[PDB]
Design a protein. Structure first.
Lengths: 76, 24, 50, 101, 150
RNA sequence: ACUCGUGCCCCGUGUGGCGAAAGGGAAGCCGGUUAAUAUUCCGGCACCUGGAUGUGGGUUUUGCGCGGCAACGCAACUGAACGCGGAGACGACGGCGGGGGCCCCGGGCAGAGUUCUCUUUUCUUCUUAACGGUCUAUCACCCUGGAAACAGUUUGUCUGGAGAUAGGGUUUAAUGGCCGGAAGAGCCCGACACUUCUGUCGGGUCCGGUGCGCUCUCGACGUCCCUUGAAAAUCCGCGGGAGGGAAUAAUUCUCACGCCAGGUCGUACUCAUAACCGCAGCAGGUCCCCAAGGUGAACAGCCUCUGGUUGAUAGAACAAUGUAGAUAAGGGAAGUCGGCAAAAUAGAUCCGUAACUUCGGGAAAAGGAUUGGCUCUAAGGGUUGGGCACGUUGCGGCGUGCGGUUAACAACCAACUUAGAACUGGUACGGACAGGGGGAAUCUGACUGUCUAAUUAAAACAUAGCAUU
C-alpha cells in the first residue's frame, strides 16, 4: 500500500482503467476521512482532516466508479 | 549484465523492425 | 516419515488394500475349502520389508 | 485545581428498605483515607446526598473510582448483602447496585 | 454418556487447556448432542460451557522483602552464600569509577575551570589509583588552583 | 539469411555423468475456518522468474544527461570481441557497547477473589505482521589549518608533520521514531433477543520508570598457533570502443504504470516408562529447537504458575528371616587379612599458615573467631540553570562585542553494594536444602591422556626430551 499526498494526483489515479473500486472510511474519534482506491498492484490511501472537501472531492470523482462507506463491524 | 538479459533486448528490436516493415 | 518417495508410497497403498477379510458369498460355493484369510498382517505383529 | 464527581446509585435496595443511605453516607465519612490517614476529610472531599437513594462525591485531589468500589463492597460484606447485590459500572463515574437473578 | 470429544473441542474453541474447561453437571444429555464446533459455540453463549479462572500466585511477600532490604534488614553475615566478588565484582567497581572521573574532567575543561595542560596531568593521575571517589578529585583541583594563584 | 532446411561466416588450450530433505541457493504475511489439513483452503494485502509489449516521462536541432572544491548525489541518462575486480566465501576464546523479546516497579479504566479484624488491597486483559515511504543511528572518507609547556583518548595504550586537536561535510549499516497496511482486525466488559433457523446493539482497548538481569542478533577492539581455519553453480561493476541512431522525428532509455504464465512428487499421525531397535504394551538404547516466579553465586537442591497426568492387580493383618531408611548409656578399632561399611568436616567474612622446592608451588597447609530479628546512622550517582551592551525573530531563539571561573550553589530523579551503633531471645541464628577430614613417611610411574563392550584401570600403553640407522 502507498500514500498519496495531494488531491490532484489522487483524482488522476482514479481515472485509470485498472481502477476497480473505492471506499470511504471515517474515524470520528480522531476526525479523519480516508479515501482508498483499489488498483491492479497497489491500494492508494488519501488522508484528510477537514470535512468541507470530502463531499467536494466525492462529487469530483468519475461517475462510473463504485464507492462504499465501510460500515462498522464488517461481516465475515 | 548477463547474456540472456542482453539477448532479450536485441530479439525485441528484430521483431519490431520486421513488424514496422510489415506496417509499411 | 513424512518425507517419502513415490515408489515407497505406491508400496504402502497395495499393502493395505490386501488386508481385508474374505467376502461372505465365497463360503457358499460348491466345493469350497477357504475358511478365513491366511495372510492377514498387522502393524504391531509383523514388519514388512519396505 | 481539577474537580471530579462520582455517583453511587442504590435506588432498588433503598426502595425495598434493605439498604439505607444514611448509614452508607456515615460509613464513607470516617473510612475514606486522605494522605494515608483516616479522618482527614477536609475541603478536599464532599459527600453530599442527592436524596433519591443516590450519593454524590466531589474530589479536588486525585481519587480513583476503583477505590470507591472497593469501599462499597466492604460495606455490603459487613451488612451481609453480598449474596443478593452486586456493584456494576453503567457509565463514566457512576456505579449502580443491582439484584442477582 | 461419554464426553471426551466435547471437552477436547471446548478447549480449542475457548483457547485454553482441557484442565480449564467446565461442563455443566446437570446438562450432560444436552451437551452430548454437540458434535460440531458450531454447536460448541452456541453452548458457550448460553452458559453451559465456561472457562475457569487461573490459580492464585501473588508476589506480595517477594516485594515486601525487597523493600526491607532497601533499608538494610536482611543482609547480615549469616545471609550471604556467594563470595564478595561474586555479589559485587571488582571490575565493575573500577569501570564505574573511571567513567565517573573521566566525565567530570571533560565537563570542567569545556566550561573553562581548567585548561588542557592540567586536564592531561589529572587524566593520567586518575588512571593511576590516586583519587578514591568524586569528592577527592574535586578537593585536589581546588588546592591546585589555589597554589597556581600565587 | 534462407524464395523454401540444402548455403555462408567467425572463435577454439580442454574434453562426461552421479554424489548433501543439517553445506551453497530467486520469491508470502496477518485474520478466519474442519470430527479429522493448512505459511497449501476462504478474505485481505504483497513478492520473484520468464515471455510479449503500449502509454507517460527522459535524451538528442553542433548526436549518447546535469549538479558538488571534494568525499559524492539525482527517476532515467548507448556500449560488441577481449580482459581485470568484487560478492558467494568461512577458526576458537575474552571483556565492552547498540537493538528486538522475556522478567521487574509506579499510575489509570474494566472484571474477579478476601473482608471477625487489617489491607487507597491481591489477580487478569490493555495487541499491531510481511511489504513500502520518510527522518536518523558506530567504523570510515573529504575540505580548512599547522601541533613541545606535546596533545587526543579505551574497562583493557593506542593514535598523530605519511598531517593530530578543533570547525564544517559525505557515506556502509534498522530487529529505532512517525505515516500507509490498520482497526474495518483481534481482545475485555455491559444490555436485549433467540425452541431452532438466528442474532442485534452499546462502551473500552492508555501513561511512565529501572538493570554487572535471561535469550537472540549486530559492531569496534584483543589473545592463540612448528595448528592460520572448503569448492562450484549463480549475480554485479569496471578498462576498451565494435556497431547504430534526430530535426520532426529518432531513441537495444538498468525510470513509472500497464498484458500473460508458472508443470511433476512429498504433506495424516507417533517420535517413545505403549506407535523406533532390543522375540513384548521390556526400569535398557536412540540426533535437535523454545525455556516463567521465590530462595540462592548459580541450568545445585527445595516450593509454586501456564500446560500435562492421577497410568502401572487389589482388600485385610503386623510373626520369624530379609531388602531399603535410622537412633543408642560407658569404652573407642580391643573386631577384621585389612577401619570394609558408617560417623566426623563442610557456605561466607576476618585473623593465622611449616618442612621442601624445578621459585611457578606446597596452600582451602595446619589452627582460631563471627553469622538471627528489630530501630537507626554513614558512604559510593544522573539531568537541568547560570552577567552585561547592540540588531533580527511571535518570555522571544539567536548574529555577535564582551566580562567571569559562583572561596561550587539550587531544583528534580534512582537501584543496588559496603561499613558502624543501640535494643531484644530458654546462647539460638550457612537453624531445611546445599556442603573439603587432617598430618609424618616408604615403593613406584614425571605430569594432563588411553585399553581387555560382559570377572583385571594398573606399576601396563602413549607422551615431550635423548640417541642410533
Ligand atoms: K540442499
Ligand atoms: K479436508
Ligand atoms: K516521450
Ligand atoms: K535527466
Ligand atoms: K561453508
Ligand atoms: K548484546
Ligand atoms: K538485550
Ligand atoms: K531489551
Ligand atoms: K527479573
Ligand atoms: K518476507
Ligand atoms: K607531535
Ligand atoms: K576488564
Ligand atoms: K544456546
Ligand atoms: K560509439
Ligand atoms: K500437512
Ligand atoms: K503436521
Ligand atoms: K521423526
Ligand atoms: K530463580
Ligand atoms: K534453583
Ligand atoms: K512387618
Ligand atoms: K518382619
Ligand atoms: K584394628
Ligand atoms: K594380618
Ligand atoms: K560455620
Ligand atoms: K631409600
Ligand atoms: K593420567
Ligand atoms: K578392567
Ligand atoms: K584409573
Ligand atoms: K595397555
Ligand atoms: K632422559
Ligand atoms: Mg582482577
Ligand atoms: Mg546432482
Ligand atoms: Mg540447505
Ligand atoms: Mg515481469
Ligand atoms: Mg562499459
Ligand atoms: Mg506501523
Ligand atoms: Mg522506516
Ligand atoms: Mg574530528
Ligand atoms: Mg497508523
Ligand atoms: Mg475493536
Ligand atoms: Mg495434529
Ligand atoms: Mg518428543
Ligand atoms: Mg522403553
Ligand atoms: Mg517393537
Ligand atoms: Mg538474588
Ligand atoms: Mg497389597
Ligand atoms: Mg538394616
Ligand atoms: Mg555408644
Ligand atoms: Mg555418649
Ligand atoms: Mg577418644
Ligand atoms: Mg569407606
Ligand atoms: Mg582450613
Ligand atoms: Mg602437604
Ligand atoms: Mg601415570
Ligand atoms: Mg572387563
Ligand atoms: Mg572393572
Amino acid at each position: 500500500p502507498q500514500e498519496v499526498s495531494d488531491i490532484k494526483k489522487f483524482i488522476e489515479i482514479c481515472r485509470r482503467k485498472d481502477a476497480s473500486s473505492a471506499r470511504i472510511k471515517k474515524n470520528p474519534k480522531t476526525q479523519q476521512i480516508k479515501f482508498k482506491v483499489r488498483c491492479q498492484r497497489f491500494l492508494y490511501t488519501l488522508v484528510l482532516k477537514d470535512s468541507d472537501k470530502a463531499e467536494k472531492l466525492k462529487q469530483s470523482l468519475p461517475p462510473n466508479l463504485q464507492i462504499k462507506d465501510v460500515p462498522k463491524r464488517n461481516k465475515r | 549484465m548477463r547474456a540472456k538479459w542482453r539477448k532479450k533486448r536485441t530479439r525485441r528490436l528484430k521483431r519490431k523492425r520486421r513488424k514496422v516493415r510489415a506496417r509499411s | 516419515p513424512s518425507h517419502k518417495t513415490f515408489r515407497i508410497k505406491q508400496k504402502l497403498a497395495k499393502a493395505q488394500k490386501q488386508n481385508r477379510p474374505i467376502p461372505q458369498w465365497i463360503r457358499l460355493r460348491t466345493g469350497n475349502t477357504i475358511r478365513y484369510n491366511a495372510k492377514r498382517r498387522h502393524w504391531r505383529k509383523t514388519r514388512l520389508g519396505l | 485545581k481539577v474537580t471530579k464527581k462520582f455517583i453511587i446509585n442504590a435506588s432498588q435496595p433503598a426502595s425495598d428498605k434493605i439498604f439505607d443511605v444514611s448509614a452508607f453516607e456515615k460509613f464513607l465519612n470516617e473510612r475514606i483515607k486522605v494522605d494515608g490517614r483516616v479522618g482527614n476529610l477536609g475541603d478536599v472531599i464532599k459527600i453530599s446526598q442527592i436524596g433519591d437513594g443516590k450519593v454524590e462525591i466531589i474530589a479536588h485531589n486525585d481519587l480513583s473510582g476503583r477505590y470507591l468500589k472497593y469501599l462499597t463492597k466492604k460495606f455490603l460484606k459487613k451488612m451481609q448483602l453480598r449474596d443478593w447485590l452486586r456493584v456494576v459500572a453503567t457509565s463514566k463515574g457512576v456505579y449502580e447496585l443491582k439484584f442477582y437473578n | 454418556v461419554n464426553l471426551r470429544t466435547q471437552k477436547r473441542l471446548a478447549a480449542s474453541v475457548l483457547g485454553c487447556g482441557e484442565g480449564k474447561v467446565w461442563l455443566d453437571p446437570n446438562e450432560v444429555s444436552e451437551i452430548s448432542n454437540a458434535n460440531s464446533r458450531q454447536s460448541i459455540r452456541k453452548l458457550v453463549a448460553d452458559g453451559l460451557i465456561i472457562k475457569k479462572p487461573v490459580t492464585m500466585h501473588s508476589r506480595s511477600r517477594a516485594r515486601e522483602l525487597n523493600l526491607a532490604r532497601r533499608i538494610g534488614r536482611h543482609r547480615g553475615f549469616g545471609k550471604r552464600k556467594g563470595t564478595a566478588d561474586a555479589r559485587m565484582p571488582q571490575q565493575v567497581l573500577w569501570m564505574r569509577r573511571q567513567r565517573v572521573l573521566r566525565r567530570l574532567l571533560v565537563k570542567y575543561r569545556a566550561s573553562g575551570k581548567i585548561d588542557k595542560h592540567l586536564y592531561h596531568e589529572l587524566y593520567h593521575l586518575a588512571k593511576g589509583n590516586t583519587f578514591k571517589h568524586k569528592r577527592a578529585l574535586v578537593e585536589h583541583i581546588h588546592r591546585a588552583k589555589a597554589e597556581k594563584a600565587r
